[PDB]
C-alpha cells in the first residue's frame, strides 16, 4: 500500500528525530513535531515507487555540543540487509570523519552482517533497529521512568560519595531496549528517576554491563 506505508515512514522518522534529540544531537524544533501533512508535502506522499522512496529520507545530524561529531541514519530498502549493503554504508562513512551510524532494517539482517557489524565496532560505531521497534517511542510509555546518562566525572563523584566500587551498583544489560535507545555502552552509568509513592521521588543508578 501507499497511505499506510506513508504513515509508517512518517512515524518512524518522528521516532528517529526524538531519539536523536534525546541523545543530545542538534535537532531543529520544526522537524521534531512535523505532522503528516508537511511530511507528505516535503517528501512526495507516494513512497511506493515514487518521490519519497528510501535513501532519500536518510538523515545526517550533528551533535549540539560538538559540531564535528555527527551521526547517519540510513533506511535500506531491502527487507533483509546483507553484507553488501553494510559494506557500502561503511564505505560511505569512510569519506567522512564521523563514525556513528544508525541502520533501520525491515527484517532480520543476516548473521554474517551482524558479525561484521560487531567486528567493525572499535572504529565504526553503528546500531541496527527493526522498523517495528521504531513505530512507537517506548520512553513516553508510563512504565518507563526518566533515564539520564551521566558523564564520567559525576560517576566518579557518585562512587566516591557512596564509597562503593562500580560492580556493587545495580546492573542494566546492553540489550535493554532503553539502553539501545540511548546508545550507551558497557562501563557507563545511568541515573534513573522514578516517582515514589512513599518518599515522593527516588533516584537510582544502573551500570551498563
Amino acid at each position: 500500500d501507499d497511505e499506510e506505508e506513508t504513515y509508517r515512514l512518517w512515524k518512524i522518522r518522528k521516532t528517529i528525530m526524538q531519539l536523536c534529540h534525546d541523545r543530545g544531537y542538534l535537532v531543529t524544533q520544526d522537524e521534531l513535531d512535523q505532522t503528516l501533512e508537511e511530511f507528505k508535502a516535503q517528501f512526495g506522499d507516494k513512497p511506493s515507487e515514487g518521490r519519497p522512496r528510501r535513501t532519500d529520507l536518510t538523515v545526517l545530524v550533528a551533535h549540539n555540543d560538538d559540531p564535528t561529531d555527527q551521526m547517519f541514519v540510513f533506511f535500506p530498502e531491502e527487507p533483509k540487509v546483507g553484507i553488501k549493503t553494510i559494506k557500502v554504508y561503511c564505505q560511505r562513512m569512510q569519506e567522512e570523519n564521523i563514525t556513528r551510524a544508525l541502520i533501520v532494517v525491515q527484517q532480520g539482517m543476516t548473521p554474517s552482517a551482524k558479525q561484521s557489524l560487531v567486528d567493525m565496532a572499535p572504529k565504526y560505531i553503528l546500531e541496527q533497529f527493526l522498523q517495528q521497534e521504531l513505530l512507537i517511542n517506548i520512553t513516553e510509555h508510563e512504565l518507563v521512568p526518566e533515564h539520564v546518562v551521566m558523564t564520567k566525572e559525576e560517576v566518579t563523584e557518585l562512587l566516591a560519595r557512596y564509597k562503593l566500587r562500580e560492580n556493587q551498583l545495580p546492573r542494566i544489560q546492553a540489550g535493554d531496549p532503553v539502553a539501545r535507545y540511548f546508545g550507551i555502552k558497557r562501563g557507563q552509568v545511568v541515573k534513573i528517576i522514578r516517582p515514589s509513592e512513599t518518599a515522593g521521588r527516588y533516584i537510582t543508578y544502573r551500570l551498563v554491563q
Binding site: 557518585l158 560519595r161 516517582p195 512513599t198 518518599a199 515522593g200 527516588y202 533516584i203
Partner: protein, 97 residues
Amino acid sequence: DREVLRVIFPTGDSKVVLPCNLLRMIWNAQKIFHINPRLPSDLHPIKVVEGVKELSKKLVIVNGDDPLSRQAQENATLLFNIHLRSTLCSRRMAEEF
C-alpha cells in the same frame, strides 16, 4: 508542591502513608494547652513560616553537605515536607487550628 503532587499521584488518591499524624498532634496540642478556638490567638504567621522552615532542616534522612547528598535528602523527605507545609499553613494555623 500541589503541581508536584498532581504529577506523582494520578487518579486523585489522597490517601497516603506517612510517619507523623500531624492532625492528631494538632488536636493533642489543642487539648493540652486549652486553646478555646473562639478568641483570637497570639501567633504571628511569620513565626509559623520560620518554624516550618527550620523544622524541615532537622528531619534528615541523607546526611551530608554534598550537592548529590543535598538532592538525595530533598527527594527522600519530599512527600512529608509537602504534607507538613500543606498542614502547618499560615492560614490554617489562624483560621482552623
